[PDB]
Design a protein around this ligand. Structure first.
Ligand SMILES: CC(=O)CC(=O)SCCNC(=O)CCNC(=O)[C@H](O)C(C)(C)COP(=O)(O)OP(=O)(O)OC[C@H]1O[C@@H](n2cnc3c(N)ncnc32)[C@@H](O)[C@@H]1OP(=O)(O)O
Ligand SMILES: CC(=O)CC(=O)SCCNC(=O)CCNC(=O)[C@H](O)C(C)(C)COP(=O)(O)OP(=O)(O)OC[C@H]1O[C@@H](n2cnc3c(N)ncnc32)[C@@H](O)[C@@H]1OP(=O)(O)O
Lengths: 387, 387
């Protein structure tokens, strides 16, 4: 088997309170907390871009041996800082991975970390001693006072894909569905997505149902065959609308289990917000750490990207996987953040658009142990390495 | 076996004469004709964007059956029109390929068409009835009077990867080499590449040597094993400088053959200019079509992207490949263009930058048999389809 061997995330060290953002925006707090299903929104300091967050997610799981064995670094992003130079190259450099490796970005809105991991697995079929690093890294920034704003977030997920993986085998059953639609897109020149709010909800649910139905059909499986489903999470309620749309005809045991998995799966996302390519895979971590699935059980995964493309595949838990997740570490990482007011979040938002550094506001002296964007000079990003 | 089953390229219907550009820039024509090695530069009308060019390279080579069999559509480009929505979705739609297909872009300067086809190969290992469509599509635009100007070009190359390929079997010997360098890049916000002209000649050549050296070591091979070599062509001279840096330690015979190969390999490129992701594969078409390689012989391929990643793999010519190329159509395509003056080319240049339509300047009436960009409305690009 080949699958997810190691996996970790990172989010920036600040968040804003969703109840507070709501007061600021003239809406009932419960519209965000219950209606949208989000409790705290990640806030980007200028000193984290996609590369640092990316390196940060990666640095704890890659050992000196991985550096030697990794044959591709693949970055999944719709928040690119270059039109030509792949983020994969800088991250590859920051992590000191061996030179004989393909580095590149993949792009298809929030979908791309899926083709990255699936194709890492196909890559490794005939290269058994090698490994692949796939990083999802993104900043969902819709604009201040926008329709999208409540669902904003930022972070990254790192997966090391390998033979005989310690966490999840990726099964050979992925099926993909593409349908050209204008739910969401960001033409060059645009800081913020164009978004058709209602259409995107429809597009998502259609994409899921087309993918699921076809998957069920090719594999002869049904919902009863899954311990849990895991969904791309633009906001926790979205995955729920989509699940409820296909589970009406499942029996009661299956509904109780899949609904409940779902709750476990969106536990982290609630405190972070949408992270585009990483959202699914963040929800995967949340699931694995908050639920107690047994080795041998099967997870159904739904990956969506605006525009649109969706995919459903399954993955099977490996024995002892619990030993390869860091629940306490991911809880420390969310709890240890610092709340900022709505005014402070807005300052941050405006600084981030223009990349206006301020070492005192980003409080960079705190970041001695992480990678961070320290400066731009002659149009080249400079990074601080972990001390 | 798995490799390139079908391949075709498209360039826009206008070129400018390189001797005439030289006079407008006040250098001796021969600095472009021999020094850089380029004779005609492609001129992009507004009506030809990366999606229409892409669809044009592909439309002549996919049958109704292909449409049912294609399981992924991958676009390699550093000239993307959207930060989120992949051009692959748009092309998938124009060409009416069946909906159960992964569509996504890959990005790494001029390199991305290589990982696109190599991962398509790996994708197909266990899927004997599927095909993959890979489209390289780019506009190399450095700016009026920039150092890069003479090496501008625009086009696309399209490749159907499949089992039992008609043309080339892709070997199991690729090795890539990543080195983080600032030779060429384009931060978001820049319409033109930031380039360090001299560094990039060095980084190119260094990348080729590293990759070539590692390949030889791993595969126990030398240049004498190769019927011909084929390189990423940013200008015909660059590939000749990279080649000459490694064949000095080779018997007169390997030297004569490889240098001659090179020359067939760059015939077409001479009349188009740089096409980033498509340059190596354009050059591949020109080699298969101008030279008389025998079934069974072996081509050694070098692929390069700024920033930088490079790669060396091999490919073997299939019995009957000649019955599967379109030499006359490709000669026709090049010969059927209309020369524009330098003023005209500059007008086309500024029009492209701003996407200013003009049906008469682009002579769209002429384009009844091809895809072209007819309009942008509510931020959505509209396409004319082949009548
Ligand atoms: C970007 C992507 O990643 C794209 C995708 O995945 S596609 C699917 C996801 N779409 C997106 O995230 C696109 C961007 N998002 C948006 O446009 C918006 O932020 C949004 C559509 C998610 C929110 O829209 P909105 O107009 O602020 O809220 P609205 O759609 O009115 O409803 C939100 C919820 O509030 C709830 N409700 C309203 N007031 C409430 C209150 N006071 N208490 C409790 N619930 C309340 C519900 O009415 C509603 O949920 P239901 O569907 O269960 O009725
Ligand atoms: C974008 C990418 O795809 C990046 C890469 O692949 S790395 C590959 C190279 N980089 C690029 O293609 C992009 C950048 N392009 C450029 O910077 C430039 O257009 C360029 C470096 C190609 C040429 O710039 P330039 O100032 O015209 O360079 P220049 O010094 O004139 O070199 C051109 C040649 O003119 C020749 N020479 C000068 N006058 C001549 C004349 N009258 N007759 C014949 N030869 C002449 C040669 O001297 C010189 O090359 P040699 O090394 O063969 O002598």
């Amino acid at each position: 088997t080949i699958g997810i061997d190691k996996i970790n995330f990172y989010v920036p060290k600040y968040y804003v309170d969703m109840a507070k953002l709501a007061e600021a925006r003239q809406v009932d707090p419960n519209k965000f907390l219950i209606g949208i299903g989000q409790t705290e929104m990640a806030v980007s300091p200028v000193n984290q871009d996609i590369v640092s967050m990316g390196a940060n997610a990666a640095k704890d799981i890659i050992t000196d041996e991985d550096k030697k064995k990794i044959g591709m670094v693949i970055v999944a992003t719709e928040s690119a800082v270059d039109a030509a130079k792949a983020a994969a190259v800088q991250i590859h450099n920051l992590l000191g991975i061996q030179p004989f490796a393909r580095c590149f970005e993949m792009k298809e809105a929030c979908y791309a970390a899926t083709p990255a991991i699936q194709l890492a697995k196909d890559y490794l079929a005939t290269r058994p001693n090698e490994k692949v690093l796939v990083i999802a890294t993104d900043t969902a920034r819709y604009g201040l006072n926008s329709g999208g704003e409540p669902t904003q977030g930022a972070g990254a997920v790192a997966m090391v894909i390998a033979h005989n993986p310690s966490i999840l085998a990726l099964n050979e059953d992925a099926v993909a569905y593409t349908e050209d639609v204008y739910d969401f897109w960001r033409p060059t020149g645009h800081k913020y997505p164009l978004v058709d709010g209602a259409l995107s909800k429809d597009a998502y649910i259609r994409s899921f149902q087309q993918s699921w139905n076809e998957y069920a059909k090719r594999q002869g499986k049904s919902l009863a065959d899954f311990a849990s489903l895991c969904f791309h999470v633009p906001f926790t309620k979205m995955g729920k609308k989509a699940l409820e749309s296909i589970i009406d005809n499942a029996d009661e045991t299956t509904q109780e289990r899949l609904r409940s998995g779902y709750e476990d799966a969106v536990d982290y996302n609630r405190y972070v917000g949408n992270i585009y390519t990483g959202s699914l895979y963040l929800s995967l971590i949340s699931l694995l750490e908050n639920r107690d699935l047994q080795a041998g059980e099967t997870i159904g995964l739904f990956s969506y990207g605006s525009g649109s493309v969706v995919e459903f595949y399954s993955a099977t838990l490996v024995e002892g996987y619990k030993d390869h997740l860091d629940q306490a570490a991911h809880k420390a990482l969310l709890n240890n953040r610092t709340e900022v007011s709505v005014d402070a979040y807005e300052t941050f938002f405006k600084r981030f658009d223009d990349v206006e550094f301020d070492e005192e506001q980003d409080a960079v002296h705190e970041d001695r142990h992480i990678f961070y964007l320290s400066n731009i000079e002659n149009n080249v990003r400079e990074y601080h390495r972990p001390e």
